[PDB]
Ligand binder design. Structure first.
Ligand SMILES: [Zn+2]
Lengths: 43, 388, 109, 325
DNA sequence: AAAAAAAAAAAAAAAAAAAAAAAAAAA
DNA sequence: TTTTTTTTTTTCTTTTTTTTTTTTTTT
């Protein structure tokens, strides 16, 4: 899933015209979580 | 254009959206009746004709405007015909018991696939669709009239009921020995219209539908109260002891817990007339438990930010080899009680049985106490008029 | 503390209406004596919108990420008195949200 | 025949209340001349709403107000105050129905109704609530608790009810003690959600929320709130936690009620006395500050009606612990 | 003691309607 | 910094748009 709640740390996702809060606490700040990508670095 | 993205609107075509989803609620009762009550599949294609024949008269309306008399009682009305036209022995007693126990879908408008129909305009249509009533004084007996007055019946379908099994069903509900079927069997041969299979009522397109009480099963049950009046007031051989009149009357007043008796109890709840008051004040520890066990499995079919306060109240404070005997083991037990079978005071023992069995059929048939007496007294004159 | 002592030494500011009473017109009018009687600062609590659906506590680690203040509610107990103390009306008001110094006796930490 | 926890049919009674309040408006208004919706609001703009109680108790040892006046009533004059407001009502008495027409003749003759609006609605949802709220009160009086817990758990799920049964499960989990968390936790759940800190002055024909037994926080505390302080006070008593309650009371400064100040005094008074049984030098200075607290809040407590046991048994206890230390 | 032309009886979900308030908006 | 629109409750009330069965009058 996309996002993560701040207060209770439960994964969730949102849609268009959907409320921006968690569904177990109603906290109003969501961290966009990290997915799998291919960033290249030089060691 | 975005203002019409928010709430969808329909004009004159709402009556078809009313009627297309009317076919959807029709189908759910049909597929239920063939599954839990194992009805035949060709019975459906009767109803697929039957629903179409009324609907053709709907598209035969001379005005484009609506004015169309439609109800949820009409839904069970057309399901009554195809059960009697195919001669399945179900009656108007069972349809009350099958909608007032929430076995089949009657009261719900939420099972309509509401993401395409109840979004549009349910404004007053779900006031018809949500079953916000019980049929008070036999509205179904007027609702079989308006469906015969829209679709003809004397030449299309067979207008008869298996009234020898209706008379079988009436005996085993109470505690009578089977000779009382045969005593009644000649009375429905004697005074019923030059012996005939009992017909459905006729096509009455008056808005008051008379005062005549020519309904079919009302003629059957009013006949039953005449015989038990007459077979007990004229038992000249002393074949029926005064202890025997007691032992049946005490056997009816005992309450046993079975799915027939529990299914009787729920229609005492929706009952508008007294004695519905003390019908829920004198139960057992047991009888309310299967009232709640019915509730926690058949009010899960209820009618559908703040969920978080709700899901916390029901979280911490939650709702947490058969002892319930069958339909025969009590009926065998209730028959073995009245084995004492092998004098102006017996009128009081007869007069007390005449009210128990009259309150019984009043409840189980959704019929007023007034209209039972008008039906039975016009019958009472017209059974003495053929003999005296 | 110094806040109830602060409003004790403000005084009572008095305005008059001037109705003559229709009775040497020593009647100046009616003595409106308005004064503040008690000040209290509430800890940070927030209601998510309206209706006091549960007023949770507000910790400051929330208040940094939102990029907004860390307020507590300020409540004046106004006294509205008439005619040198005849008719007094004690109404608490909601006079804004003032900020609150962290780790003090008005912070949740 | 108990009370049903929902609001009812609004078809004829809302019209029946309008015909009743229009006739009481005119036969008042003819009477106040000769004794020298809007008709509903004219009734309630007059007097009051009793918010913190059902009825309005007042003082007897006060002003006199004796009406020995005349006995001021003839059948001649009263039937003249009756006559034209009857004629004023016959002109709108044609729109109400015959059953409504029959009702107004009964109350103008001085008669009272007999059938209540609960017993005549006949809805499928309503008739299943009514048989449950009467089965609830029946088995609670009989102490059929494990059955009555099953009644309450299914009544709160039905989509029409509101929780006008705060005391039913407020008292049920005190008696069950099988699985569920006790009545402190349900009472916590009420004070979070039903604070309602708005000071909404009356102005409104109220019909869905009658009582003072579930309101709060306009000028009067919630009834379920102060039973949460009292139930927490008895709960910490059964150790011999008291810090957790005493911080919880100080977070509201509720500067109007003195019932909460008596609980605030009572939770220091328990702390000052269980800290002497554990005693028998810093453990003696902490006793005195609790007594200096209690002696201040009892003097705060003299702003309204008397929450003094006497005013002496509060302190006759207090000096008995000072004789110890 | 049974066939008829005038209406009323209900009913229930959605849009609205005064009261009050939160409390920025902006020039 | 003055009025302040802009908005939001907030419970109580009306709208909508049909359906079900009346009553007295003759035969
Ligand atoms: Zn969350």
């Amino acid at each position: 899933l996309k996002y993560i709640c701040a207060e209770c740390s439960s994964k969730l996702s949102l849609s268009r015209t959907d409320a921006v809060r968690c569904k177990d606490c109603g906290h109003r700040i969501l961290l966009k979580a990290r997915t799998k990508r291919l960033v290249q670095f030089e060691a | 254009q975005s203002h019409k993205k928010f709430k969808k609107l329909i004009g004159h075509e709402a009556k078809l959206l009313f009627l297309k989803s009317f076919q959807f609620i029709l189908k759910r009762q049909i597929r239920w009746l063939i599954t839990e009550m194992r009805f035949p599949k060709e019975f459906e294609h009767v109803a697929k004709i039957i629903w179409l024949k009324i609907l053709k008269t709907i598209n035969d309306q001379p005005q484009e405007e609506l004015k169309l008399q439609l109800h949820m009682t009409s839904t069970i009305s057309i399901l009554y015909l195809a059960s009697t036209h195919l001669s399945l022995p179900v009656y108007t007693c069972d349809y009350i018991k099958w909608i007032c126990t929430a076995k089949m879908p009657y009261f719900q408008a939420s099972e309509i696939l509401p993401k395409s129909w109840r979004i549009q305009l349910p404004n007053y249509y779900v006031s018809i669709l949500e079953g916000s009533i019980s049929p008070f004084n036999g509205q179904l007996y007027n609702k079989i009239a308006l469906t015969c007055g829209m679709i003809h019946f004397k030449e299309f379908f067979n207008s008869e009921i298996s009234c020898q099994g209706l008379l079988l069903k009436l005996v085993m509900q109470c505690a009578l020995p089977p000779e009382f079927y045969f005593y009644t069997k000649q009375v429905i041969e004697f005074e019923e219209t030059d012996i005939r299979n009992l017909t459905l009522w006729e096509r009455t397109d008056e808005r008051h539908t008379g005062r005549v009480s020519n309904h079919a099963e009302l003629r059957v049950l009013s006949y039953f109260m005449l015989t038990i009046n007459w077979m007990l007031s004229f038992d000249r051989d002393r074949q029926y002891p005064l202890k025997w009149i007691l032992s049946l009357t005490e056997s009816l007043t005992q309450r046993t817990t079975t799915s027939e008796s529990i299914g009787r109890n729920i229609v005492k709840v929706v009952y508008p007339d007294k004695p519905t008051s003390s019908d829920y004040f004198q139960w057992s520890e047991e009888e309310t438990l299967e009232f709640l066990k019915w509730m926690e499995k058949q009010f899960l079919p209820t009618q559908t930010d703040q969920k978080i306060a709700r899901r916390k109240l029901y979280k911490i404070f939650p709702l947490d080899s058969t002892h319930q005997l069958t339909f025969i083991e009590d009926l065998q037990e209730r028959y073995a009680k009245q084995t004492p079978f092998f004098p102006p005071a017996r009128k009081e023992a007869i007069g007390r049985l005449l009210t128990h069995i009259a309150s019984q059929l009043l409840v189980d048939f959704a019929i007023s106490k007034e209209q039972l007496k008008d039906c039975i007294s016009r019958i009472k004159n017209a059974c003495l008029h053929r003999m005296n | 503390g110094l806040l109830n002592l602060g409003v004790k030494d403000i005084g009572e500011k008095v305005i008059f209406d001037g109705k003559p009473l229709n009775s040497n017109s020593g009647y100046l009018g009616n003595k409106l004596s308005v004064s503040v009687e008690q000040v209290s600062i509430a800890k940070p609590m927030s209601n998510d919108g309206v209706s006091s659906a549960v007023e949770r506590k507000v910790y400051p680690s929330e208040s940094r990420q939102r990029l907004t203040s860390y307020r507590g509610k300020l409540l004046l107990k106004l006294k509205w008195s008439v005619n040198n103390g005849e008719e007094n009306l004690f109404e608490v008001r909601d006079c804004g949200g003032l900020p609150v110094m962290l780790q003090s006796n008005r912070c949740h930490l | 025949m108990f009370e049903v926890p929902i609001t009812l049919t609004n078809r004829k009674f809302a019209q029946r209340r309008k015909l009743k309040y229009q006739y009481i408006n005119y036969i008042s208004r003819r009477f106040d001349r000769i004794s020298k919706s809007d008709e509903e609001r004219k009734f309630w703009k007059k007097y009051e709403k009793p918010e913190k109680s059902f009825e309005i108790w007042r003082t007897v040892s006060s002003q006199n107000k004796q009406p020995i006046n005349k006995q001021k009533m003839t059948y001649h004059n009263f039937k003249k105050i009756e006559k034209i407001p009857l004629r004023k009502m016959e002109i709108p008495l044609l729109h109400c129905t015959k059953e409504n027409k029959l009702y107004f003749q009964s109350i103008s003759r001085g008669l009272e109704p007999l059938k209540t609006s609960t017993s005549e609605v006949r809805n499928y949802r309503t008739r299943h609530i009514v048989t449950l709220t009467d089965l609830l009160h029946l088995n609670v009086s009989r102490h059929n608790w494990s059955l009555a817990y099953k009644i309450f758990a299914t009544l709160i799920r039905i989509p029409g009810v509101q929780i006008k049964s705060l005391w039913g499960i407020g008292v049920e989990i005190l008696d069950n003690l099988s699985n569920s968390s006790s009545g402190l936790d349900f009472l916590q759940w009420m004070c979070q959600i039903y604070s309602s800190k708005s000071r909404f002055v009356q102005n409104i024909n109220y019909r869905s929320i009658v009582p003072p037994f579930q309101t709060g926080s306009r000028t009067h505390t919630a009834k379920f709130a102060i039973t949460y302080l009292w139930s927490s006070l008895i709960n910490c008593q059964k150790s011999m936690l008291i810090d957790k309650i005493s911080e919880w009371v100080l977070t509201p400064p509720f500067m109007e009620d003195a019932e909460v100040w008596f609980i605030y005094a009572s939770c220091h008074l328990l702390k000052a006395d269980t800290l002497s049984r554990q005693f028998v030098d810093i453990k003696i200075n902490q006793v005195i500050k609790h007594i200096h607290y209690v002696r201040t809040f009892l003097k705060i407590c003299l702003d309204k009606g008397g929450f003094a046991v006497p005013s002496r048994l509060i302190e006759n206890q207090l000096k008995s612990f000072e004789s110890r230390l």
